[PDB]
Design a protein around this ligand. Sequence first.
Ligand SMILES: [Ca+2]
Ligand SMILES: [Cl-]
Length: 381
Amino acid sequence: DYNVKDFGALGDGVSDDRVAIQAAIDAAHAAGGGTVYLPPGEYRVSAAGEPSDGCLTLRDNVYLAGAGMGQTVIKLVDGSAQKITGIVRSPFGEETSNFGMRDLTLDGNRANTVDKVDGWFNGYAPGQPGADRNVTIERVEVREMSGYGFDPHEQTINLVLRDSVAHHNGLDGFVADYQIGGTFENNVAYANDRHGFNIVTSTNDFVMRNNVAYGNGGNGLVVQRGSENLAHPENILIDGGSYYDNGLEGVLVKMSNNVTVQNADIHGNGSSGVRVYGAQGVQILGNQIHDNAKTAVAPEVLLQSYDDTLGVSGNYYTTLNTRVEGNTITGSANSTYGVQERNDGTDFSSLVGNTINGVQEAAHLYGPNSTVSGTVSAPPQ
Ligand SMILES: [Ca+2]
Ligand SMILES: [Cl-]
């Protein structure tokens, strides 16, 4: 057990406590590990150096703990004017293990600073073999970052990020970038200017259990390849939770495969509830998908192919083998179809046992091998 007071941290809302807190982290690390405690207070921090130096660098076996979200706050100094990749982060180009944070708030002070600031960052190095592992983040709030809220990054094995909140950030609340065997559980993302949750860059064997995303400018959740010619995300389970009142689709799956969205409540989004865009083997199971298309006419579920022939892969990604089963889909005034396929090569969809109401047509299919069975709809008046 280490206490940042013993290293000269003032926690007074004005003094720069970066050097004191980093000294407590380094002492815990040199001793073989420990928990660095921050008692209640606002702890101001400045940038440590170059963008990859963040503000504070955690190390192997070191955990930060505050007195509770909103009680312990680590906040960027007024007037900061440089890119900061993680107010708390792991070292760049090192495989860092058994570290994390709990019971505190990170505040990026976007109203009184400039340039891109991310709340949490960790990883090894883009394109390089190597992984951080056993990151545990519990009961953390990340707010007011001009960049990302939480950005666990390439590569991390066995992330646990639970019971946390990301809000009022300029990009995405939570990013899962090249995560392997990781979990987001019981998190909330709201009022971010882009996505609530963004799973990207080859993430695989990843669980999103009981997460909530609402009021974000982008998607509630997007699962996507990203901008580079990399292995697509695959083997992703979205289990339960709620994705509502977002600016774009509730849930977007783009150039990713073997993603399951199940038992979720998806409603009030600007465009479709669920969109599948150049994806294979997606399973949309047992969801309530209703009252979407709030911004303009759209189907509750859209299935379409992604034309990357002039992009980084050179490939045309048809959407194939989508299973849409056991959903209750209820359109509202702007909803066109319950499930729409574009006439773009999308094929091998199978609709099974959906309850579909409130739409112009339950299913609007084009694939020569796409099928629909067991749709339930209210009988005509
Ligand atoms: Ca690292
Ligand atoms: Cl269309």
